[PDB]
Design a protein around this ligand. Structure first.
Ligand SMILES: [Mg+2]
Ligand SMILES: [Mg+2]
Ligand SMILES: [Mg+2]
Ligand SMILES: [Mg+2]
Lengths: 401, 401, 401, 401
């Protein structure tokens, strides 16, 4: 049999190699065994305020499974859920720690059994995966900058379509009229109540310009990053329904599920959420209340592959399809690709604007990128990724033995 | 006006000074200002899997408020909620980081204004605070060890009453037949479904013996630590109803609020929970579904004094009274005392079996202990504690400047 | 320590100095202590039928706290709630009496601690406060008269915008086709059922003329003063949705919360209410039923600053923002300014058309007015207002000793 | 036709004529007409904090109907509801002012038409009215003082039965161990959460002793005066169910109707409330949620005879029967008797322990007292009372002409 021998934690402070990417700190792990099979995982706190907590949570959780059999993945998941105290009252950090370990264990099991992770998740259901260009308020391809003017948003939409995408996502309210970023800066605090005329006009004009540039057929997902409250989310939705919006993502935060239901009932645009929703239990009220068209769990936050699969299976009975949230290192991308290949209720894959950055790509050994708007799964045993040790040795923070 | 100059984070690995306390690791902070006024706070992850994540979250949050005016407490809270990404989909670790900072800010403001924190929370509403002896499964007073036999539990109860308490709390199922601890060990996995006869008998016998030793008048709170599921929680409740139980704490975890409601409707014992429920949003479904008689936020987890007050005020409209959850360092205790002194809907104060332990006491410079089953408020400016520098220098982990 | 020594009640029958303002009777109080620190408050019954009851309620409540420590503000509030009989079945008059006393106690506590009241409410969250010109059916600035013709309403909108406002409020149905006032006269009794064509046309034409005059960007709040019933409120709302209405205030009275929900579900205009809703308990059904976008408690009716803060905190979890209702003397204005400065869910401040009247301004020592559409908080200890004794000595009605 | 010429308001400070009755201050009015017909009414704020507000509200409302035709009772009621501002967000004081006027108008109309008021309410439905001896915690008959010991309560019960009653009401928790009164004093603040063992025992012992002294057949109503909260109300109910309790009155206050429902569902004792519930709107949630077996509007608070009748008629469709709340002057009694004589859903009449007191009796010119546990209706035109001018001249406070 196998025993876990050590877990390495990498604090990937990208600013050390790429000062461009200073808002960014992937947290990667490697779980090693006495057989010599290792697996890699990722804690999904690469952006916002969380990376150092993410490193910490691996230090908290890793000691509990040193010496244990990695193949009992359900048992290990349940132990973390039940026997840690915080497993039964956890959130983004705790479940991110479980997720990272869980991903690595799936990687190990695939290598042990000689097959890609999608085989272990039910086989090749989807041979290729429709993909969108994500977060175009930061540009696409050539012109990468913070976009303010409607013409700039139109240009980014054209760039993405020229790159062979037939779907894009944009947050048209994140960037204020001065070019400040409302996700991370105290700007437009009124967003949580009702929009001002200028703000409604700013957001609608960006979407209008993008729809004009793209034509009618390509799809537009409107990302809101939980910036709006129930009333402004509905207000803005009604202003943009005329542009044929595919999905309306995180119109408000997920903490009040009844408010999510009210948003969904009050616009014709289908609602997506999930990146800030963790475990089956974090989807129960969203699904039961018929509030969402699309679930977007992050496999590096929601409980990993074991739990992600369960969220997908559950979503299916409410006609809710799945786009895994992906915004971190290469490990998140491969976990998503295996999940999406296997699940019958896949809808679309998210290709983040920064997924081609050198400092992200160099963390791992393989590069999986879309071609002409489509992704395919890795075919090697396990996830099909390893860490690039030449780079990650500089990011090694802790070894749990 | 004032400016935050640095935040110190203390990783209190108590095992370094007391090998008996290796299950515990308080996480303390100190927020310093350019006036020389400092405030102290606590991240409520002293037990279970979480301490190192708690250290990390302070590394993540502290840099965002270095240089800012500490007096703008509501603004700082809201910024953490809104502009960090994870504040709108947090959990135990994120909200614990917010809590510690918030508590340190109230300490600063009390010191600045020259009054105890209870004055800033509305004044001296409750002159003294009824207190219970908490967690008697580990003994009380003279005989402190893991208790197994009904007679041992009866002895603990007598010891508590002799110490001047007229209320105790006990988890009569945590310890199995062999003395193993179900909270942190993989024992009695069947607890989440239905109890076996031996287990029902084991728990009831402990309660029965305790009630016999105490007499009818002293109160028994039954703690379940979310060890049971809906069905076993009800099964066990109905077996112990005959002993006149004051509160039933965490019969199940709080992740499914409808199941909490079902428990509440299926026993005559009033339900308490809340140590694993964070922010006002954490209490909305519990209160609206009329599921709980007593809310138990931990001020070092639930969002601090600012948010804890709001939880208390909200609970009041549903006739839900409050016992702050306290299991950590001396900072958690004083935050609790100030809150409980101010709120009209205080019910009882939790005095944990280890809150008198040297290795916990020695973190801070003052003593606050109950007398004749009652607590009173600190009366000095601010929280009424400082760090004991001679001790905590050995625990200093990071300074954010 | 401090003890309350006396409470003065001022029956401000403005007609004694200003026959123009004969519909108006502010009720002010002053609470004095043995330290020489005094605080002022206001009973929010300056208009409609209530002022003499308001004077009476201070006579009823004041004796109960002579000799008591004013710093225990929560204790005093709770005593009035619990131990007066009518505190637990009260309404506008009883809660107005509690509010006035509560405001004065906050004033005292701010002076005692040397800081403005907003500091005690959580600090400076909002540095400036967007303000609307309120009740333009009575004119703005130059032409103050009862407005009937659509051109007159357009003129008042222009006057307000010229005064530097970017938002206005108007009740376009209060004034009937003969210039009578439906709020206080038995006219258009059919309003509670369904509107007649002429009435629908009258109201819509006024709003249309105002939107035309203002342009598209400035905001229009439509005040209904509970004149309409569920069916006519919806009927009228649907007629005016085309003009981009910001808020629809008091479309019906608050006594049937399910009817409020039905109104909210049946129009795209966000609903505001609250001036006739008192205490947390008066908002529970409004919020739970997701009926309101904006809460408008009057701090001189709803339970004061202590309770107002609690209403704001509660509203926030439903994405409900707050505009304090202000239509009385200068004390109401300052209480609102301190509240709005501190709360994270402020949306807009109400500047009533009569807030510049000489006979109102002369009641107090300071004048706080908006500049270019914005208010700021007072900065002196306490509320930042005192009574102007030269004037108010003529209004002194009772001293409770 | 007739015209109202003046309204006299009497501030009945009974302490001026009887120092034993200093807790009580009836507020009476007389409405005079140009025909010489007068009517009398009562503002139901004779106890608790409210009398002077009640005098004031008559000053506020009276001027609005001087000169009007008193026969248009529905019109006058509706005008107060609709055209005063506060009538659509009132409460105890506002609706009490409406009530007093309304009762005086029915007195006038009965006199004008030459028939007792019950005839105008539908006729003599109930020839006699079962009556209970109310509030035995203050003694009955020979021994009138604050009662403490179970034997004292048993003695009160025997005294009532000897007086010909076959039903009593008692609040067994209002008086503490030391004889202090929890209704108006800050004692037993914990009552709003959960009862302590001593308090549960104290209340149960009083009920037990009473049931023993009475025998099984006579009825016991348990009054709680809204002293308990949801959880303690249920706790105490379940302790006294064994004594066969007829009604449980005001187990909690009426501000949260969902909690009232929860109480109703959690005990086998039928719930009564309504003295602190006003207008039909005050009863809607109570009746629809099937929370109450018996409604207890006070006609001097709930909106008078006009509105009281409507409450009775509405309660009927939910099988809710009516006991009018009566604790005030002789006017409240006769209004009750006429209402109860007419309504098909009468259940029992409340005879308060002080309704026979000289200082209350002497306010009016006639005697109406129960006999052998039964009341009958007055038979003279109108209400069947006049003011005793020789007494009330000393209480005259205002005349509105
Ligand atoms: Mg997103
Ligand atoms: Mg616990
Ligand atoms: Mg209004
Ligand atoms: Mg009663």
């Amino acid at each position: 049999s196998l025993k876990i021998t050590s877990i390495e934690v990498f604090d990937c402070e990208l600013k050390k190699r790429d000062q461009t990417m200073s808002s960014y700190n992937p947290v990667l792990i490697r779980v090693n065994t006495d057989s010599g099979l290792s697996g890699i995982g990722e804690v999904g706190l690469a952006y916002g305020a969380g990376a150092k907590a993410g490193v910490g949570i691996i230090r908290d959780l890793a000691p509990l499974i040193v010496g244990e059999d990695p193949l009992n993945i359900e048992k290990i998941w349940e132990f973390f859920f039940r026997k840690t105290f915080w497993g039964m009252g956890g959130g983004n950090v705790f479940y991110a720690g479980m997720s990272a370990i869980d991903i690595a264990l799936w990687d190990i099991k695939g290598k042990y059994l000689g097959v890609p992770v999608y085989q272990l998740l039910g086989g090749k259901t989807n041979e290729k995966l429709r993909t969108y260009a994500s977060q175009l308020q930061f540009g696409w391809g050539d012109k990468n900058h913070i976009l303010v003017t409607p013409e700039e948003y139109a240009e980014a939409a054209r760039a993405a379509l020229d790159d062979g995408y037939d779907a894009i996502k944009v947050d048209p309210l994140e960037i204020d009229r001065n070019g400040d970023d409302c996700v991370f800066q105290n700007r437009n605090r009124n967003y949580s109540g009702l929009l001002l005329a200028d703000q409604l006009k700013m957001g609608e004009a960006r979407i209008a310009a993008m729809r004009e540039a793209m034509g009618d057929d390509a799809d537009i997902i409107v990302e809101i990053h939980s910036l709006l409250g129930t009333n402004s989310a509905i207000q803005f939705a009604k202003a943009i329904e005329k542009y044929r919006i595919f999905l309306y993502e995180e119109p408000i935060h997920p903490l009040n599920s009844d408010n999510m239901q009210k948003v969904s009932r009050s616009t014709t645009i289908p609602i997506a959420t999930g990146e800030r929703s963790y475990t089956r239990w974090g989807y129960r009220e969203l699904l039961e209340k018929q509030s969402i068209a699309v679930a977007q769990p992050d496999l590096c936050l929601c409980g990993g592959i074991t739990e992600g699969k369960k969220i997908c299976d559950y979503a299916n009975i409410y006609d809710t399809t799945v786009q895994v949230h992906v915004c971190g290192g290469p490990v998140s991308t491969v976990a998503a690709l295996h999940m999406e290949t296997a699940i019958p209720n896949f809808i679309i894959h998210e290709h983040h604007t920064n997924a081609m950055k050198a400092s992200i790509r160099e963390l791992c050994t393989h590069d999986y990128q879309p071609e002409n708007g489509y992704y395919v799964a890795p075919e090697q045993p396990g996830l099909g990724q390893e860490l690039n040790d030449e780079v990650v040795k500089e990011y090694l923070a802790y070894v749990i033995k």
